[PDB]
Amino acid sequence: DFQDQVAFITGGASGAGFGQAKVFGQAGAKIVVADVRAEAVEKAVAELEGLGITAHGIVLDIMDREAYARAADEVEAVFGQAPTLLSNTAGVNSFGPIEKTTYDDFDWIIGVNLNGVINGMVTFVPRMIASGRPGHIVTVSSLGGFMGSALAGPYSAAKAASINLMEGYRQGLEKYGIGVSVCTPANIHGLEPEKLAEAIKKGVEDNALYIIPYPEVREGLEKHFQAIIDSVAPM
Amino acid sequence: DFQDQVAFITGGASGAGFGQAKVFGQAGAKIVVADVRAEAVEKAVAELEGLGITAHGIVLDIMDREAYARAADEVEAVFGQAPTLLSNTAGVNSFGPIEKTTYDDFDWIIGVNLNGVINGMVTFVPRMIASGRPGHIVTVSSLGGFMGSALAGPYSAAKAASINLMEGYRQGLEKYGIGVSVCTPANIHGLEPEKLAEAIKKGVEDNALYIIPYPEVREGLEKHFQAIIDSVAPM
């Protein structure tokens, strides 16, 4: 189903990233674990090889644009082609009052949750297009992307941009047979990493723009959006 | 009404920024024109003084965090207090296919339309809180912030974050008697700069979170949001 697909997953040495590695791998995908913690990568790829998944590890801070370029070359060296599946799953956060936020807070959080995915898109999109192969791109953003918050202001804002940016790339890349999705988990008891992983693989198969596997949020999302619509001036 | 209010307006040497300078100034506000084009600032402040508005010019690239800090000091030197009204109105854009986007495209566009407003918020928010005075903060974002696009991908994404970030600061700053709004013009024949300016001044008075003076967009905005809601998994 995903046999002879290559998947590049950021923040894949853990959580949702790793869940994806496992789920896509069990479906036949060759996997590339990109994560910053070198020890965790080593562990994670081993555990994948232990599951009969062919897997390669790359230690990478996605905020480094040149290293992101090296990795992408590495991927073509190892598996003889550019990825056919990109997952920007890496994420970080810290809580606290939005007023108290500092430049370092911003740089770090915006850096991972937005700039990290931009670097991903700029790096791979041309290579994926040049391959002339069908492909797909997921970004694990957040539900907080749909609604700014006082305690996760920076994080929510960056996720708000990744959602939008995916909305944009979907339109751009359809003509290239490359689908685009964005997953918006409810992180504001809680959906398990493998559960969410299966939701993403389904979304990829369905070529869904949005992946929101949380029936409970519907009410609040409707309410947040109505407030906006209601703000629209008459007549 | 705005007598003895101080207003710091980015991208105020032109367009919506300048419109605001005029509108708020005619209402009694002392004005600070912050814009990068030194000649345009000079012209703009003159034209304001010509209208009986007390006005000071500051040449400033908002992407420079330290200069943004110098300006904020300058503002307190000149008018003997931190601003009581902040407007992040500065904006830039360039059209083209989202796939073709480059790092410089991103840095420039994200830099002005997002990082510029973050620098604004980080600079002034503490000073405004420390003043112990009521205040207000507007960001002129965009309607494209509510919907990502193939031809204005970077721009739309940054505006998507500023909207969200304002959504967040509103919640944070209410306890400080500081309101927050975001204006989302329809820039995707067209509302005049002074017309839009009056809409913002009304929004400031009303302490409205959203300022969307474009009755026509309602249908499309409803449609975009429903698509999201419809993506929410049953049950």
B79 neighbors B30 (Cβ within 8 angstroms) = yes
Of A164, A214, A221, the CB nearest to B160: A164
Give CA separation, B80 vs B30, B32, B56, B87, B107, in Å. 11, 13, 13, 19, 35
> If DSSP states are collapsed to H, E and C, what string results for A19-51?
HHHHHHHCCCCEEEEEECCHHHHHHHHHHHHCC
Joined together, the tokens standing for residue A190 give 């809680």
Give CA separation, A143 vs A146, A184, A218, in Å. 6, 5, 11
Gap between the Cα atoms of A57 and A39, Å rounded: 10
Distance of CA A147 to the CA centre of its chain: 19
Q: Is B149 on the interface with A (CB under 8 A)?
A: yes
Q: Is B69 on the interface with A (CB under 8 A)?
A: no
The coordinates were experimentally obtained by: X-ray
Task: List the strands of the sheet with A178-183, edge to edge.
Answer: A55-59, A30-35, A6-10, A85-88, A135-140, A178-183, A210-211
| Helix H or strand E segment including A182 | strand A178-183
Of A150, A210, A229, the CB nearest to B218: A229
Gap between the Cα atoms of B199 and A194, Å rounded: 48
Total domains in the fold of chain B: 1
Name the minimum distance, in Å, from the CA of B52 to any CA of chain A. Answer: 31
Contact residues for A25 (Cβ-Cβ < 8 A; gap 6+): A7, A31, A48, A51, A53, A54, A55
Domain containing A196 equals: 1-235
Gap between the Cα atoms of A141 and A112, Å rounded: 11
Of B106, B165, B213, the CB nearest to A118: B106
A160 and B158 within 8 Å at the Cβ level: the answer is no
CB atoms within 10 A of CB A185: 24
Joined together, the tokens standing for residue B89 give 């109105």
Cited resolution, angstroms:
2.6
Residue bearing tokens 């979170």: B209
Question: Cα dihedral sign for B159, A93, B135, B79?
Answer: negative
Give CA separation, B51 vs B12, B44, B48, B55, in Å. 15, 11, 5, 10
Concatenated DSSP letters of chain B:
--TT-EEEEETTTSHHHHHHHHHHHTTT-EEEEEES-HHHHHHHHHHHHTTT--EEEEE--TT-HHHHHHHHHHHHHHHSS--SEEEE-------S-GGG--HHHHHHHHIIIIIHHHHHHHHHHHHHHHHT--EEEEEE--GGGGS--SSSHHHHHHHHHHHHHHHHHHHHHGGGTEEEEEE---------HHHHHHHHHHHHHHT-SEEB--GGGHHHHHHHHHHHHHHBPP-
CB burial readout A85-106, b (16+ within 10 A) else e:
bbbbbbbebeeeebbebeeebb
In degrees, rounded to 5, the angle at the alpha carbon of residue B99 between the alpha carbons of residues A29 and A78 is 35
A37 belongs to an annotated ligand binding site: yes
Contacts 24+ apart (CB under 8 A), B222-230: B222/A229, B224/B146, B224/B147, B225/A225, B225/A228, B225/A229, B227/A209, B227/A210, B228/A146, B228/A210, B228/A212, B228/A221, B228/A225, B229/A218, B229/A221, B229/A222, B229/A225
A124 neighbors A136 (Cβ within 8 angstroms) = no
Residues of chain B found within 8 Å of residue A211, distances taken between Cβ atoms: 231
A20 neighbors A97 (Cβ within 8 angstroms) = no
Residue B13 phi, psi dihedral angles, 5° rounding = -80, 5
Check which CATH number belongs to the domain holding B96 and give it: 3.40.50.720
Joined together, the tokens standing for residue B165 give 């970030």
Q: Is A125 on the interface with B (CB under 8 A)?
A: yes
Contact residues for A14 (Cβ-Cβ < 8 A; gap 6+): A35, A37, A40, A44
CA dihedral A61, A63, A66, A72 (to 10 degrees): 60
| Helix H or strand E segment including A85 | strand A85-88
Q: Provide the chain B residues 167-186 that lie in CB contact (below 8 A) with chain A.
A: 167-173, 176
Gap between the Cα atoms of B131 and A129, Å rounded: 54
Number of H helices, E strands in chain A: 8, 7
Gap between the Cα atoms of B184 and B147, Å rounded: 11
Residue bearing tokens 């791109």: A137
Contact residues for A78 (Cβ-Cβ < 8 A; gap 6+): A32, A56
Distance of CA A146 to the CA centre of its chain: 16
DSSP 3-state percent helix, strand, coil across chain A (nearest 5)? 55, 15, 30
A162 neighbors A169 (Cβ within 8 angstroms) = no
Closest among A188, A190, A95, A105 to A141, alpha carbons compared: A188
Joined together, the tokens standing for residue B214 give 């474009």
A138 neighbors A182 (Cβ within 8 angstroms) = yes
| Helix H or strand E segment including A162 | helix A153-173
Give CA separation, B100 vs A117, A167, B96, B104, in Å. 16, 16, 7, 11
